[PDB]
Amino acid sequence: MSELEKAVVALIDVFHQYSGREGDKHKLKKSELKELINNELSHFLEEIKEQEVVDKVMETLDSDGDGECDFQEFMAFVAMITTACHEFF
Amino acid sequence: MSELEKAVVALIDVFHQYSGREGDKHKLKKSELKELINNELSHFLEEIKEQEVVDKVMETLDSDGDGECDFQEFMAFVAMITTACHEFF
Numbered sequence: 001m002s003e004l005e006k007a008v009v010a011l012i013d014v015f016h017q018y019s020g021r022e023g024d025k026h027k028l029k030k031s032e033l034k035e036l037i038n039n040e041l042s043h044f045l046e047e048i049k050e051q052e053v054v055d056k057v058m059e060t061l062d063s064d065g066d067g068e069c070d071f072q073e074f075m076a077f078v079a080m081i082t083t084a085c086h087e088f089f
Numbered sequence: 090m091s092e093l094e095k096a097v098v099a100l101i102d103v104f105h106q107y108s109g110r111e112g113d114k115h116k117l118k119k120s121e122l123k124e125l126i127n128n129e130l131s132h133f134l135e136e137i138k139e140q141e142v143v144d145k146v147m148e149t150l151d152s153d154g155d156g157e158c159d160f161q162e163f164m165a166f167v168a169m170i171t172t173a174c175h176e177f178f
């Protein structure tokens with residue numbers, strides 16, 4: 001697989017690794033998002049150390065008002081991050 | 090860097106290796122998009138070698154009508170591919 005293909009599979013791989021941990025296996029609840037951020041985005045984003053910060057990130061990424069982050073909501077997030085990274089270049 | 094961080098930077102690195110070959114260094118003209126797809130998406134997509142197929146794909150991805158694919162347009166393309174792959178699993 002090419003560099004691009006590996007990255008696409010990796011976005012899926014990571015989402016599922018965290019979403020699959022508790023309850024709905026296709027959505028990130030607040031605990032799993034916190035773990036994803038803390039363990040997969042430790043160079044790009046501040047560590048979240050407080051629940052009320054977690055709560056605040058979730059309500060942003062959660063567009064459909066269900067309290068959790070689904071794959072399309074996670075892709076929105078990844079696009080936000082990649083755009084900030086691209087701009088930084 | 091984590092699986093996720095590597096994947097973000099790969100999206101950038103791939104776009105810019107193809108975008109910087111001709112003309113605008115931050116956009117993909119048709120020839121650059123052609124080779125990116127042909128060389129970086131070969132397990133996901135069929136190769137494209139007829140100019141009216143290239144035209145049609147560019148027409149699909151070009152949202153601002155300048156005849157090129159910029160980075161936000163490439164990320165839209167990536168999220169598409171990523172969504173289709175997630176669907177399969």
Ligand SMILES: CN(C)CCCN1c2ccccc2Sc2ccc(Cl)cc21
Pocket residue numbers: 043044088089
């Ligand atoms: C382009 N450069 C000079 C920054 C390098 C990339 N880089 C980075 C980039 C943008 C935002 C945050 C970071 S954290 C980081 C931590 C370790 C390493 Cl090894 C690299 C990075």
Ligand SMILES: [Ca+2]
Pocket residue numbers: 018019020021022023024025026027028029032
């Ligand atoms: Ca879950």
Ligand SMILES: [Ca+2]
Pocket residue numbers: 061062063064065066067068069070073
């Ligand atoms: Ca949601």
Ligand SMILES: [Ca+2]
Pocket residue numbers: 107108109110111112113114115116117118121
């Ligand atoms: Ca170019």
Ligand SMILES: [Ca+2]
Pocket residue numbers: 150151152153154155156157158159162
């Ligand atoms: Ca365009």
